[PDB]
Amino acid sequence: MQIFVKTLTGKTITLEVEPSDTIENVKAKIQDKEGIPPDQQRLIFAGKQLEDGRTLSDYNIQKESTLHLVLRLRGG
Amino acid sequence: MQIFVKTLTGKTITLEVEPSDTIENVKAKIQDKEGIPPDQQRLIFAGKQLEDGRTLSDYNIQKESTLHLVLRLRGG
Amino acid sequence: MTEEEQFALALKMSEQEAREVNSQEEEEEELLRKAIAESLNSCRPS
C-alpha cells in the first residue's frame, strides 16, 4: 500500500508500506528519503503518537492515510 | 553527556560529564584544562551560583547546557 | 581588571540563556499539542 507523511515545513512525503510494517520501519523509510535520524522523529496519526514496536495495522492505518511528522533538534 | 562553560574572557570550554558529577568534579575538570585553582572558580547556571557538594542533576543541568565561569574575588 | 562589570555580564548572559531556553521548551510543548489537536480536527490538506 501507499501512505502520506506531512512535515512541519508543509512538505508531503509518499511511502510504500504494508500494514505489517513497524513504526520503526516507517522511521527508517523517512531516514532513507530525508536524512532525519529515527531518534529525532515523532509520528502522529488521529491525535496519537506512534510507537516503534507497533505496526500500521495496530493503529488501523490504511491506504492513502496522512501521518503528521514532528521534529526539532538534538538526539539525547 | 557534554556541557559548555563560558569564561570572563569570552572563551567557550567543552567538558564531558554525567548528571551525577559534583560541582567539585566540574571545578577539577576546569583545573585540568585551564590550570585554575578550584578555590578561585565560581560557577553560575541560569543566574544561580553552584555549590561543591551538589551535582549537575540537583540543578537540572542537561546536555549542551551553558555554564558561566566567574573569577578573582569580591574585594578591590 | 574589573570584577563588577564582568560578574554582571556573566549573570546577564546566564539570564538570557535561561529565558530563551524556557521559550523553546514552551514553544515545543505547544507545537506537540497543536499537532495532536490538528490531527483530530482535520487530517486532510487545508
Q: Could you list the residue range(s) of the whole structural domain that residue A22 is in?
A: 1-76
**Number of separate domains in chain B:** 1
**DSSP β-ladder status, A42-45 and B66-70:** unpaired
Task: Give me the CATH number covering residue B40.
Answer: 3.10.20.90
Three cell numbers written together for B70: 566567574
Strand intervals (E) in chain A: 2-6, 12-16, 42-45, 48-49, 66-70
Least CB–CB distance from C3: residue in B47, B69, B72:
B72
In a 10 Å sphere around its CB, with 0-12 CB exposed, 13-18 middle and 19+ buried, how is residue C8 labelled? exposed
Residues 1-40, chain B: which have Cβ within 8 Å of A? 1
Three cell numbers written together for B47: 543566574
> How was it solved?
NMR
Amino acid at B46: A
Name chain A's partners: 3 or more CB pairs within 8 A.
B, C
Q: How many residues does chain A have?
A: 76
Beta-sheet strand order (sheet of A12-16): A12-16, A2-6, A66-70, A42-45, A48-49
Three cell numbers written together for A2: 501507499
